[PDB]
Design a protein around this ligand. Structure first.
Ligand SMILES: [Cl-]
Ligand code: NA
Length: 256
């Protein structure tokens, strides 16, 4: 084998957050010199690709839109391939990522985190579409997330609500699903066994990736807490102190 692609988590790994991880920018420059394929990945249901992109550029990361693959991109890919018309239960700010997807006579349900749509009447309409055989596509299933005033419900509980109602599993597109990481390499010409994933979240980043054949590097910044390394078996391929260190390891060890 040989290493041809690198998947880099964004939040926790490159920036943490609205401030860059120290060395991150120069480390990414080192990476681009290595002549390796690079894809920046993340779970989001509310930030468009341009939104993330604008933020990364303000932190002086030089990145293309073609290199960013998020759970929204993944949700959009699935829609094009299945040729379906979604009922879009998503934040308005995610809509630019479904530009061009037809919504008339919906025959699919896409769920992200969308408080304005998460109420009885609209959930029951989604339910009634599911009964009719429409698939349920979950951008991801996080239970909760941390906002200014405490933890708040993520999309995961609402998705789980509809699975329970219909007694069926959603198709989950984001991390840690296997299909996420495989979709991330579509168009790269690269197989997962020729790829490494770098992130701060052991289950969602390393666990998920290692499960498709990728090498997983846990970095100890951002969301990482002490001993997170042993929350998976097998353990991570490598546990580094930060993205820069991960990059240094890739250059001196894996790149042939
Ligand atoms: Cl391909
Ligand atoms: Na992360």
């Amino acid at each position: 084998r040989a290493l041809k692609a690198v998947l880099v988590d964004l939040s926790g790994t490159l920036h943490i957050e609205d401030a860059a991880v120290p060395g991150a920018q120069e480390a990414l420059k080192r990476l681009r010199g290595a002549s390796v394929i690079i894809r920046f990945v993340t779970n989001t249901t509310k930030e468009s690709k341009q939104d993330l992109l604008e933020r990364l550029r303000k932190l002086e990361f030089d990145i293309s839109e073609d290199e960013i693959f998020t759970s929204l991109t993944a949700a959009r890919s699935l829609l094009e391939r299945k040729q379906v018309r979604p009922m879009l239960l998503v934040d308005d700010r995610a809509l630019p990522d479904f530009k061009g997807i037809q919504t008339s006579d919906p025959n699919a349900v896409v769920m992200g985190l969308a408080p304005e749509h998460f109420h009885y009447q609209i959930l029951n309409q989604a339910f009634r579409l599911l009964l009719d055989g429409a698939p349920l596509i979950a951008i991801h299933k996080a239970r909760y997330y941390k906002r200014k005033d405490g933890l708040a419900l993520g999309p995961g509980p609402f998705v789980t609500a509809l699975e329970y109602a219909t007694d069926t599993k959603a198709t989950v597109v984001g991390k840690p699903e296997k299909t996420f990481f495989l979709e991330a390499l579509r168009g790269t010409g690269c197989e997962p066994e020729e790829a490494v994933m770098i992130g701060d979240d052991c289950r969602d980043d390393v666990g998920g990736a290692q499960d498709v054949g990728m090498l997983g590097i846990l970095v100890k910044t951002g969301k990482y807490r002490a001993s997170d390394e042993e929350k998976i078996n097998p353990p991570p391929y490598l546990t580094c102190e930060s993205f820069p260190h991960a990059v240094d390891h890739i250059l001196q060890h894996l790149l042939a």
